[PDB]
Design a protein around this ligand. Sequence first.
Ligand SMILES: [Cu+2]
Length: 142
Amino acid sequence: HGWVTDPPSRQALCASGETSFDCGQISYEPQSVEAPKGATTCSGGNEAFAILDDNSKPWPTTEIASTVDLTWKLTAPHNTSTWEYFVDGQLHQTFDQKGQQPPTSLTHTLTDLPTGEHTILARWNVSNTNNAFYNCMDVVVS
Ligand SMILES: [Cu+2]
């Protein structure tokens, strides 16, 4: 369990009360967006958190540069295979954890992000289960 805190993901903004709409249950457990490997949606297909896929909502955006430091907060650091990052649904960067347990505070540096409005998807793959954790960040790159 864990979620991306900076730049804040959709479940982070819900849990911190930064959205102008009620997000439901996810507001109380942002660390729990868990779903089988292989998806590219913000919820991963977890039906209890379907609001995270609704793009009609006025989701807030974050202004960032093309090179940005991205921070996770883990509550239960499971042995990890890879951390995958997509930009608008297309794989951008991969980090290999070699099946090791990560630190509960973890920072990665993304580079070469395209300018304009985009949505990053962070996919955390657990090495000893069939599940991953899904985090979306809406951003404006300049
Ligand atoms: Cu867990």
